[PDB]
Amino acid sequence: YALHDIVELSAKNVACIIQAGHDIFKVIDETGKVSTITKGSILSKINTARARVSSVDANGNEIKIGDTIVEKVGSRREGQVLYIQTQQIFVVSKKIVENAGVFVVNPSNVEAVREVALGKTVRIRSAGYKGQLGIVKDVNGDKATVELHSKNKHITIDKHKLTYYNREGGEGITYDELVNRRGRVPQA
């Protein structure tokens, strides 16, 4: 375990390390109390990057891990959020030396500073390349990138105006059955 690492002390206790030792670690808990524990007291390390935890600030703006926030009351400490607890947030600040710059604050007291089309043969309907077979590569949201079979170029076209066909021939279906009905190529 290294500095600033998140440690799951128990099923409901999460702490942040402020002084990473060999076998003895000083950790501040969600309640702000700083205590010294042993390596055995840590069940496992919580991965902040893989932790999909979000909270709501006073202004209502969503705050995620790593976002810079400033306390509305107190010393107005500014710092980056390392982890988000059910009722508390741990924030590390480079301007504070106390507790390695890590402090636990309430979220309300701070303010912030499955594609069906992909991988299926399609034909364009309303464009300059209508009626041309294409293979969907990726979708950027509201627009689908398709490579044309007869042309060595990739074109971005709205997916709603494309008709999808079966892997081998089959009938054409617009972008209304896959959204409603589960992704299933028609029968050839």
Binding site: G119, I135, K137, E147, H149, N152, H154
Partner: protein, 85 residues
């Protein structure tokens, strides 16, 4: 554990794209996996700067009997401004 951007959907059950399949960018042409001791992908991605319709695929045995695959891809190139004559 080793997976590349190449789309493996074009690959069939045998692992080789049949003639008449559109391939572009890093799309995998030959699907090969080397067991590790469970296995790591060793596919042959298509040339990034070249693309076209796969023309032919053949499978044979090497001098030692190991499976060998050769895939020829054909593209139609039309004269452009930058072409040299």
């Amino acid at each position: 554990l080793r997976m590349k951007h190449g789309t493996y959907d074009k690959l069939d059950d045998d692992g080789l794209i049949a003639p008449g399949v559109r391939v572009s960018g890093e799309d995998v042409i030959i699907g090969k996996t080397t067991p590790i001791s469970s296995k790591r992908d060793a596919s042959t991605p298509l040339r990034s700067t070249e693309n076209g319709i796969v023309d032919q695929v053949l499978v044979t045995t090497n001098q030692d009997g190991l499976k060998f695959v050769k895939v020829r891809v054909r593209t139609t190139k039309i004269p452009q401004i930058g072409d040299k004559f």
